[PDB]
Design a protein around this ligand. Structure first.
Ligand SMILES: Cc1cc2nc3c(=O)[nH]c(=O)nc-3n(C[C@H](O)[C@H](O)[C@H](O)COP(=O)(O)OP(=O)(O)OC[C@H]3O[C@@H](n4cnc5c(N)ncnc54)[C@H](O)[C@@H]3O)c2cc1C
Ligand SMILES: N[C@@H](Cc1c[nH]c2ccccc12)C(=O)O
Ligand SMILES: N[C@@H](Cc1c[nH]c2ccccc12)C(=O)O
Length: 629
């Protein structure tokens, strides 16, 4: 009897196949001849964009240990080339066919295929990815569409990439949405670039819920009255967060788009602009679009005529060329038959850690958990370790499954509370999820085993990337020691985010929200760093057009749009003139202090009262996770 069958091979399955090979566990992969959206984009030459996620979080530990030299954003070309490199390694273990049905029995499954070939396997892993409504827009994208009006009912990363591509053809963009969370993918800390995933210090949740909440939520919840923040200039960007019923913030189910702020885009790409655009580094600064009026927000309930193709806002009856109805994610699951009869019903919350479904025996889901920030790699590497351990170690399989339904209830209580199921429940802060799996497997760090201040920075401030948990123990990867050293040497041992937590420990949430926004350039949606880049924007559009052989007329002037932008930007035209740094000073001084006591013994530190606090990090009081204990 075949020990393991993996269904679907693109990106998510790679780390699991690697571990099954290492332990010589018998496995077969079944995967469609057709392949993925990445094959659609490759075949049709549309891998001309870049990831919304850092290198560190988007490539597996066993690639990073070889190829990491600096933080950067990989291109769609590089990401796909990496999938193709791993497909080549394992292609001999792949049967090219399409699974149509799985019949699940007490200790095996019967797998049916389009060819008619059937397979028996004791353990079955689904790594088939999602169907996405929006893929047709990216895969069949037309760049000749010019001077047209688009209406989007949802802001997501796909809409934002479409918008980046339309705007340089003088396409006008109306968003008719119930708000959206957008975050600068890259941020300056005392004049040095940090990808946003470098600054989450997630294990601070263990100090307390409230402290972590103040560390994280002021750029997402409308907490500052600072008029430089996009959610004050353009309030139609605010969301209804009344659904959230959890002390764990950011909450599971919160989705964000991650975008190039124009200032960081300029710092990286200004010197070789056309060549960088052609590699797929597209400016996608939604806040700059709102600032310049190349995008407008309108209320959710703004009347539209689907028959005449018209949207009803202020004075002009604007005909729209296309309505984009907004991306949904549905797992590509075959029919699964419980005891080979009863259709399995998929719901993210009714699986443990997005991986283990109830009422199925030895079936695992790999790649259906979505990270709030950073790449999928962080999530699928840790899920792969979890699945490998369940498959190959019956003691671990028994430990997890014995109280499976209780673990799931305890997880849902902790992370969702009494909220009803939502379509985005599958979205998790990457640094909670990786840490959660690491504690389940037993490859976690213990805060009580920190000796030096340097050790506290590593435990609390070093990002909870999957490779963090592959330094030593059961899943160690060779070269992780050198990788961690390199990353620490380039990021000042994450002293800056450690000092952020030290700065806000005594504040309430309004105070921390004010302090967050006291910076000369605060992390996210700082509308003071837009006007100075108006000339560079024109250079950019000219560069984009030249790269893509586009010719449009700005000497042709769209009068009617010029007119609707004024109505859209009334709060901004009122709020912006009220503009005009505690955070910069606090952080600068704190980093000085921390970097001076790097190698000081914690336990022995003498009796401001930040010392008390630093000493208490050996004994955090919010460490309990009832779905693990
Ligand atoms: C436009 C776009 C941009 C993205 N950008 C990023 C990014 O910036 N950073 C990031 O980290 N992630 C990004 N992602 C998300 C993620 O990395 C990709 O979705 C990735 O392809 C997921 O890998 P996967 O292996 O789970 O699924 P896939 O890559 O879709 O591979 C699954 C494979 O299984 C096959 N298959 C499906 N059903 C069956 C079946 N029943 N039988 C047999 N074979 C089957 C499919 O044909 C496919 O080849 C992006 C996704 C998209 C669509
Ligand atoms: N802690 C950093 C970065 C940060 C805050 N909120 C976030 C949400 C997601 C990602 C990063 C962040 C700051 O306060 O600016
Ligand atoms: N364009 C993809 C982006 C995406 C999906 N899942 C992700 C995980 C990590 C980074 C990016 C993504 C989407 O439809 O949403």
């Amino acid at each position: 009897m075949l020990e393991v069958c993996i269904i679907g091979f693109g990106f998510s399955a790679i780390p699991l196949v690697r571990e099954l090979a290492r332990t010589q566990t018998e496995f077969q992969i079944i995967s469609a001849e057709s392949g993925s959206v990445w094959d659609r984009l490759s075949e049709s030459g549309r891998l001309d964009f870049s990831l919304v996620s850092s290198f560190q979080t988007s490539f597996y530990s066993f690639d990073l240990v070889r190829d990491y030299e600096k933080d950067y954003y990989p291109t769609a070309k590089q990401f796909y080339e990496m999938h193709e490199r791993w497909r080549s390694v394992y292609e001999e273990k792949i049967i090219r066919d399409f699974v149509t049905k799985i019949e699940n029995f007490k200790d095996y499954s019967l797998i049916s295929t389009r060819s008619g070939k059937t397979y028996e396997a004791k353990h079955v892993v689904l790594a088939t990815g999602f169907d996405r409504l929006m893929n047709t827009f990216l895969s069949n994208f037309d760049n000749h569409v010019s001077n047209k009006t688009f209406v989007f009912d949802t802001m997501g990363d796909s809409a934002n990439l479409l918008i980046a591509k339309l705007i340089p053809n003088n396409n006008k963009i109306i968003l008719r949405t119930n708000g959206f969370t957008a975050l600068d993918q890259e941020v300056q800390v005392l004049g040095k670039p940090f990808t946003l995933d470098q600054l989450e210090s997630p294990n601070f949740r263990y100090v307390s819920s409230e402290l972590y909440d103040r560390l994280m939520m002021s750029p997402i919840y409308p907490r500052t009255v600072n008029p430089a923040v996009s959610y004050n200039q353009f309030p139609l960007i605010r969301r209804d967060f009344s659904w959230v019923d959890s002390k764990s913030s950011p909450p599971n189910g919160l989705i964000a788009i991650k975008y190039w702020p124009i200032d960081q885009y300029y710092y990286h790409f200004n010197d070789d602009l056309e060549n960088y655009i052609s590699k797929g580094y597209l400016l996608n600064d939604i806040a700059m679009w709102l600032h310049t009026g190349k995008v407008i927000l309108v209320p959710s309930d703004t009347p539209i005529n689907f028959d005449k193709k018209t949207i009803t806002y202020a004075g002009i009856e604007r005909s729209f060329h296309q309505y984009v109805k907004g991306d949904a994610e549905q797992p590509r699951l075959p029919t699964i038959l419980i005891n080979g009869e009863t259709p399995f019903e998929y719901l993210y919350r009714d699986t443990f850690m997005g991986v283990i479904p109830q009422r199925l025996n030895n079936i695992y889901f790999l790649g259906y958990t979505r990270p709030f920030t950073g790449g999928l790699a962080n999530i699928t590497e840790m899920q792969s370790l979890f699945i490998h351990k369940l498959i190959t170690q019956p003691q671990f399989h028994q430990k997890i499954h014995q109280n499976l339904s209780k673990r799931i209830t305890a997880y849902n209580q902790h992370y969702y509370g009494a909220a009803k199921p939502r379509k985005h429940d599958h979205t998790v802060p990457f640094g909670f999820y990786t840490e959660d799996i690491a504690r389940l497997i037993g490859i976690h760090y213990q805060p009580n085993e920190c000796r030096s201040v340097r050790d506290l920075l590593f435990y609390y401030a070093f990002p909870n990337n999957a490779f963090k948990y592959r330094l030593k123990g059961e899943y160690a990867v060779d070269g992780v020691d050198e990788l961690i050293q390199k990353v620490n040497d380039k990021h000042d041992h994450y002293a800056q985010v450690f000092v952020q937590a030290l700065s806000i420990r005594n504040m309430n949430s309004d105070e921390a929200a004010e302090w967050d926004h006291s910076a000369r350039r605060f992390s996210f949606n700082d509308m003071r760093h837009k006007e100075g880049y108006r000339a560079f924007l024109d250079t950019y559009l000219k560069a984009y057009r030249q790269v893509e052989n586009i010719s449009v007329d700005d000497t042709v002037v769209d009068e009617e749009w010029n007119f609707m932008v004024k109505e859209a930007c009334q709060v901004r035209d009122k709020v912006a003139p009220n503009i005009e740094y505690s955070k910069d000073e606090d952080v600068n001084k704190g980093i000085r202090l921390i970097l001076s006591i790097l190698d000081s013994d914690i336990s022995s530190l003498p009796d401001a009262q930040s010392i008390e606090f630093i000493r208490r990090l050996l004994q955090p009081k919010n460490y309990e996770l009832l779905f693990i204990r």
